[PDB]
């Protein structure tokens, strides 16, 4: 079963579940951060999100709304520090409480990314790379630097320069990602839990007249486990590469009609991938199983890990072996069963999906993806029992709010979030 | 919008004698990032001093300054310290504060500040 550390931002770090860790993007950089082992394989590094940016794209400023919303100062002491930390180690406690996300975790704490890339020859394991390890500073922080690259799968930060745009994030070099490739790579998060996401595409609102229409906020444990759906995809080596799918009308369920990643279509479920054509479908199918070709043709061809000893090739042979659903057979040697891998591909890309995960933790979600930004709000305070719990999130029937999920109308509950203006 | 760094603390001391140097930073979050001091020197290229995290846990120094800077940072008063000990002629240059660490250092940097034992 899958297991929630619980930990204090102030907690010495002990390296156990507290380490300071150079994150991929800032390799052989030297910025270590403190960081916190939620669950095997899982960190989160309660900082503000910054490789890619300038540092003033934080502070933009001006009777208008805008979709994107700044705060230079979030996460900017230890105790909002804190508060972060304990708001994630509740999210995934809410993510634990059903079988269904339960297993997610579990998918994604086992899904280790392969030892190497593209770039890593047949023959070789290499793990010196930041797609497989991250570097642990291991002597004590008054100390000359010392440090060891440890294994990991996702490591969660605070948001980037707009705070409601959550995102997942994987690994490129040379144009290419170990995590669209069959390998699988160390994934990354910007995620903000208190700004979220608010909707009304929704059935009920399609009859309805302009000042008829109703209007909800999202349950960050949801808008979470989205992100964790792409965090599975891409320690799969699966992740849908750059491919934005154009609809060729709108449909009932959508509610604008831009261009959206498929990569998004697959991970929202509902009727979203009808929007994708057959044709363009297949050779999503066709091109990952060309890539578990090519990876099982590396697990055939491996004789040696070049970067660490103490590594067992056969173990981890094994390990793999077990990731991808490949068949052995008397020469110790590995193969593809389609028959098996139609079962890991539809698993993997059609069992998890908000759709059915909202359906499944009883919570109002969209329509559909193609739904139209609308200005985010501030939830106050997700640490409070009264407001939001880990079994119902904000539809608690105790105080009458899980009917026609009332707790998550903005019209009703109106004391779980303010105007973010 | 940008960024902005000035700092202080400036000026013949004698050997060996103490100075606090100090940069405050405008227009990004300060919070955020790793900042450096580095400095230069006549004749000499540029040389970096220190450097320290975002929460202030991580301190590095050159071997030239070792026993004698400390580095400091105030994330409330978005204020970065170096305290030089001990001075020597050596230490005597143009000091900038600049973001990033040793080995990234980032284009954003100050006006400078002299110093001279």
């Known amino acids: 079963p899958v297991t929630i550390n619980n930990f204090n931002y102030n907690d010495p770090i002990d390296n156990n579940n507290i380490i300071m860790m150079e994150p991929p993007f800032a390799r052989g950089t030297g910025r270590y951060y403190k960081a916190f082992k939620i669950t095997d394989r899982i960190w989160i590094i309660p900082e503000r999100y910054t490789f890619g940016y300038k540092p003033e794209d934080f502070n933009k400023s001006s009777n208008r709304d805008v979709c994107e919303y700044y705060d230079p100062d979030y996460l900017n002491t230890n105790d909002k520090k804190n508060i972060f930390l304990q708001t994630m180690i509740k999210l995934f406690n809410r993510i634990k409480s059903k079988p269904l996300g339960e297993k997610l975790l579990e998918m994604i704490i086992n899904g280790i990314p392969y030892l190497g890339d593209r770039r890593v020859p047949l023959e070789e394991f290499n793990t010196n790379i930041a797609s497989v390890t991250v570097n642990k500073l291991i002597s004590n922080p008054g100390e000359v630097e010392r440090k060891k690259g440890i294994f990991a799968n996702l490591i969660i930060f605070g948001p980037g320069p707009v705070l409601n745009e959550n995102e997942t994030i994987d690994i490129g070099i040379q144009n290419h990602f170990a995590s669209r490739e069959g390998f699988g790579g160390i994934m990354q998060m910007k995620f903000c839990p208190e700004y979220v996401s608010v909707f009304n595409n929704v059935q009920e609102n399609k009859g309805a007249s302009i000042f008829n229409r109703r209007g909800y906020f999202s349950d960050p444990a949801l808008i979470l486990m989205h992100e964790l759906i792409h965090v599975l995809h891409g320690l799969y080596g699966i992740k849908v590469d750059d491919l934005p799918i154009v609809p060729n009308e709108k449909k009932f369920f959508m509610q604008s009609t831009d261009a959206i990643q498929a990569e998004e279509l697959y991970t929202f479920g509902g009727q979203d991938p009808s929007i994708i054509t057959p044709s363009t479908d297949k050779s999503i199918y066709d091109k990952v199983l060309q890539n578990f070709r090519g990876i099982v043709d590396r697990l055939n061809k491996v004789l040696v890990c070049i970067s660490d000893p103490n590594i067992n090739i056969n173990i981890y042979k094994n390990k793999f072996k077990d990731k991808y659903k490949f068949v052995e057979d008397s020469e110790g040697k590995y193969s593809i069963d389609v028959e098996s891998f139609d079962k890991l591909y539809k698993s993997l890309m059609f069992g998890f999906t908000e759709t059915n995960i909202a359906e499944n933790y009883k919570i109002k979600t969209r329509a559909s993806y193609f739904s139209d930004s609308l200005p985010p709000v501030k939830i106050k305070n997700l640490l409070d029992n009264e407001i939001y719990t880990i079994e119902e999130g904000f539809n608690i029937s105790d105080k009458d709010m899980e009917k026609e999920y009332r707790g998550q109308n903005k019209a009703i509950n109106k004391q779980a979030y303010e105007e973010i203006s | 919008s940008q960024v902005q760094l000035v700092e202080s603390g400036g000026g013949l001391v004698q050997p060996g004698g103490s100075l606090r140097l100090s940069c405050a930073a405008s227009?990004?979050?300060?919070?955020?990032?790793?900042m450096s001091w580095v400095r230069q020197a006549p004749g000499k290229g540029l040389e970096w001093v220190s450097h320290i995290g975002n929460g202030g846990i991580i301190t590095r120094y050159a071997d030239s300054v070792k026993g004698r800077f400390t580095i400091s940072r105030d994330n409330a008063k978005n204020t970065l310290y170096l305290q030089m000990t001990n001075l020597k002629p050596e230490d005597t240059a143009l000091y900038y504060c600049t973001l990033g660490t040793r080995d990234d250092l980032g284009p954003e940097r100050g006006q400078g500040t002299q110093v001279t034992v």
């Open positions: 227009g990004f979050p300060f919070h955020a990032y790793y």
